[PDB]
Design an enzyme around this catalytic site. Structure first.
Site, PDB file in Angstrom:
ATOM      1  N   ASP A 178       0.814  -1.217   0.000  1.00 33.53           N
ATOM      2  CA  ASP A 178       0.000   0.000   0.000  1.00 33.53           C
ATOM      3  C   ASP A 178       0.851   1.271   0.000  1.00 33.53           C
ATOM      4  O   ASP A 178       1.951   1.323   0.573  1.00 33.53           O
ATOM      5  CB  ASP A 178      -0.939   0.024   1.209  1.00 33.53           C
ATOM      6  CG  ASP A 178      -2.194   0.869   0.963  1.00 33.53           C
ATOM      7  OD1 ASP A 178      -2.959   0.568   0.005  1.00 33.53           O
ATOM      8  OD2 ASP A 178      -2.423   1.824   1.739  1.00 33.53           O
ATOM      9  N   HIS A 189      -7.649  -1.314 -10.011  1.00 37.40           N
ATOM     10  CA  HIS A 189      -7.611  -0.267  -9.008  1.00 37.40           C
ATOM     11  C   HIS A 189      -6.646   0.849  -9.379  1.00 37.40           C
ATOM     12  O   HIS A 189      -6.959   2.023  -9.231  1.00 37.40           O
ATOM     13  CB  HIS A 189      -7.196  -0.867  -7.664  1.00 37.40           C
ATOM     14  CG  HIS A 189      -7.237   0.109  -6.536  1.00 37.40           C
ATOM     15  ND1 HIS A 189      -8.395   0.755  -6.156  1.00 37.40           N
ATOM     16  CD2 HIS A 189      -6.265   0.558  -5.706  1.00 37.40           C
ATOM     17  CE1 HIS A 189      -8.135   1.556  -5.138  1.00 37.40           C
ATOM     18  NE2 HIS A 189      -6.850   1.454  -4.842  1.00 37.40           N
TER      19      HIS A 189
END
Lengths: 307, 307
Positions: free
Chosen positions: B147, B220
């Site tokens: 992330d 994404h």
């Protein structure tokens, strides 16, 4: 001897813990027994895999569930949690079918393992309670006082915690009691230092034990450190840790022991006190919301089940 | 310039976080304003005190509460959370009057501070939600993918996150959006690696960005990495972290930004998609249970209130 204790019954302390209570669904015993053996073995192997971060843990079985799972035999002295009460001092019993105790110096690893163990139990059980504990400073309780000072160290840990040949089938195992104590911290931290210190029976910073002549009888240390018929120390091996968040926090008291009445004797002496009216005034500041009795069998006991 | 950003709006990553949502009680504004200035200052000073463990944090104010607290003026573009929905893809708005964001490489310290801040607010507010986040492995989401790769680094962090002289009174501050995403991890981890990787638009282990010619439009990365009228990167500064436990876990998505519509544009492109029907299929695997808009003022803005 033969049978191996689950590691983590006697592990030295860690930075993080995960505490999981499951209750079993109906008639799942045939499939749960081997599925537990899997999880125990998983936990044992993980001690090597994650030695980086001192991972250890164990699986323990609720006293009220044991006869369902393992109907053929029991640990000699396995009994429910000894609930007690008098005045605002309650030690209630809330039993759970299964207890999974996970410890590691890394949190992320515990999270992973917890997920994996959950995914292992499939649809055989339901997670009822989860709590995550942590080391607070230098092994201090949220009360600000050092915890576990009086714990046994060395090979004595096993001597205290683990069943020996007094019940050979269950040698290697340990009687495990658990109470979730919710501290009233704002009430506590409004006590001046000396009132805090007189309540516990040691100095706060340096954690110095009071001279016995000074220990108040209502102090925690006086009240919990006991001796049998022959003046020998009645011991347990605490694996307790702080837990919780603003909504509710305190100490996950975890007792591990050869016999389950070492814990009893101590809890009794806190609640009902010394017979001359002096009880553990530390209970004025924290509340046991739960109380649970388990046995953590040796790995080898668990593993004798396929089927 | 004059006004100092709260640290921790732009802090580099940490191991542990605490997220606190308070709602204020009735007519407490007179007393809460200075009481906040206290807490902000406390948080700022703690960065030095606990530099050992990289402590940082901030206090931010709910968009729907701002006018009550600070009626005399506003951040130009402050607006509620932009709730959206279509199909099983919801981004709901649940606003909170106050947000306290605490980060540290030690958990015990965060626990201490959280208690202290709570005790600070006295009876002026009510804790509504608390969540604790953690670094999972090498800055990975519970999904197993890295992330924050695309986050700005260096002095560019401030350029992206903090209001500049385009609204001088509020220079130093940042528009903060927060969504609690609950991952359906069992559903996710049943995808073969390549389906996972095609959903995100990078390789899992080495986290290698797909060649744009290969990025699926439903991925994404394709869906969140955007560009204005002039093909310039529309950026935010994510401070997101994994959170939760077995009962519910995922990502605490936290966006910090000069403007609050950089976040909007991105959320829109996930939910409603690209206008040609392609939306963010990562939403097939996680659910935003909450969505909240705040402004984290500069320290100096907050501090201009006694009274």
């Amino acid at each position: 001897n033969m049978p191996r204790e689950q590691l983590g019954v006697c592990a030295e302390g860690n930075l993080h813990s995960v505490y999981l209570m499951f209750n079993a669904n109906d008639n799942v015993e045939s499939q749960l027994r081997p599925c537990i053996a899997n999880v125990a073995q998983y936990i044992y192997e993980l001690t090597d895999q994650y030695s980086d971060s001192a991972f250890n843990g164990f699986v323990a079985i609720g006293a009220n569930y044991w006869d369902s799972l393992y109907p053929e035999s029991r640990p000699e002295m396995l009994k429910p949690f000894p609930a007690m009460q008098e005045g605002n001092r309650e030690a209630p019993a809330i039993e759970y079918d299964l207890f999974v105790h996970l410890r590691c110096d890394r949190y992320d690893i515990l999270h992973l393992v917890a997920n994996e163990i959950s995914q292992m139990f499939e649809d055989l059980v339901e997670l009822v309670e989860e709590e995550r504990g942590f080391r607070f400073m230098d092994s201090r309780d949220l009360t600000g006082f050092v915890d576990g000072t009086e714990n046994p160290k060395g090979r004595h840990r096993q001597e205290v915690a683990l069943v020996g040949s007094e019940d050979p089938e269950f040698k290697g195992g340990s009687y495990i009691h658990v109470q979730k104590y919710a501290h009233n911290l704002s009430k506590w931290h409004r006590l001046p230092l000396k009132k805090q210190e007189d309540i516990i029976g040691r100095t706060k910073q340096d954690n110095i034990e009071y001279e016995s002549e000074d220990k108040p009888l209502t102090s925690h240390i006086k009240r919990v450190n006991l001796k049998d018929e022959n003046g020998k120390s009645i011991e347990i091996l605490r694996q307790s840790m702080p837990y919780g968040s603003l909504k509710e926090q305190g100490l996950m008291f975890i007792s591990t022991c050869r016999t389950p009445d070492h814990f009893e004797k101590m809890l009794h002496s806190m609640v009902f006190g010394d017979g001359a009216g002096n009880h553990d005034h530390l209970m004025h500041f924290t509340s046991a919301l739960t109380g649970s009795s388990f046995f953590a069998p040796s790995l080898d006991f668990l593993m004798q089940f396929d089927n």
